[PDB]
Amino acid sequence: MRTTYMAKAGEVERKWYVVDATDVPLGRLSAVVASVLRGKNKPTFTPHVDTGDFVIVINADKVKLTGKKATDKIYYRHSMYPGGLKSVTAGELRDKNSRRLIETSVKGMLPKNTLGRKQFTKLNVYGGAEHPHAAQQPEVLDITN
Amino acid sequence: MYAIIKTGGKQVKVEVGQAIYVEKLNVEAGEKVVFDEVILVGGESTKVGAPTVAGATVEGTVEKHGKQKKVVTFQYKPKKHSHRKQGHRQPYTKVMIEAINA
């Protein structure tokens, strides 16, 4: 034992940010977002305390898919029954249920335990153009990342 | 105050009136001790320094000579037939600090 800063539970203060997704490839937007959420960029990082922030994503319809993957990046599922493999979707979810897109392409790039789940419910993604959360005064981030 | 010191192979942050544990020193219980090397002088006017800020010392006295608790290291190899057994009590000399940089 010696002296190294170990964040407690409540001392950490979270903020609110608003990020656009207008003409950005899916990968990199998700990457920046996922890095912000886990609590990095805060020198008070602690690898078992949830020091994250709250992210709000706008215009989830105008997200960009480079080349093909408009009609080739085939998602999947399986219903745990014989012959249940339902590959239903494609890069069509941009149209419909556009929340589903980022809510997988990020719920992948996180850890896989409770911390990596309670660190996921801080996500709020809106295909539209304006959020209802003005009750909490979110700010804006930029992307040259 | 606020200062940084090289002892053993490590650094430490030092403040007036608080003790500090370090490695053995070859000095007796209750004599003065001076550390040569400083790397920073903090507080409210940071004196950053090229290695070993020139002309900065740290007094302080020694109060005890005592070892730690045992760190048993028994090794064994499975499917074969072997154990080695060990023991250890590392000695560390507690040091009370007074009169940071003069």
Binding site: T3, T4, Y5, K40, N41, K42, P43, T44, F45, P47 | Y2, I4, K10, Q11, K13, I39, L40, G42, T46, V48, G49, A50, P51, V71, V72, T73, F74, Q75, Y76
Partner: protein, 118 residues
């Protein structure tokens, strides 16, 4: 000359047990399984005593990442400039400074910015 086996064994076994207080079931009242558990615990203790020294470097590194990057200094170029301007702070102290004494950390970042600028 018949040497009986009076109490040479219980000393040994009950010395093993006490070394296994609080194991998740019948691994604290079975003189056969307590021993195997103690053995594996010894292996793990040894290995991880060599990992306690690994992590804290990766941890201080991530913290220097977070704090430094805010000043436009990537976590490489900061260390590079520092080891170029002949400044030799130890990572642990750099992490501590980055967390607490923001003014001093920014002073160092300024000196480094000046350093590799040459």
């Amino acid at each position: 000359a018949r040497v009986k086996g009076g109490t040479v064994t219980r000393k040994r076994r009950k010395k093993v047990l006490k070394l296994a207080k609080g194991y998740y079931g019948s691994k604290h009242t079975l003189f056969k399984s307590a021993k195997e558990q103690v053995m594996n615990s010894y292996y793990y203790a040894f290995r991880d005593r060599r990992q306690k020294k690994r992590d804290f470097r990766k941890l201080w590194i991530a913290r220097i990442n977070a704090a430094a990057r805010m000043n436009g200094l990537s976590y490489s170029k900061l260390m590079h400039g520092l080891k170029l301007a002949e400044i030799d702070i130890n990572r642990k102290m750099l992490a501590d400074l980055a967390v607490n004494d923001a003014a001093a950390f920014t002073a160092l970042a300024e000196q480094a910015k000046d350093a590799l600028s040459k």
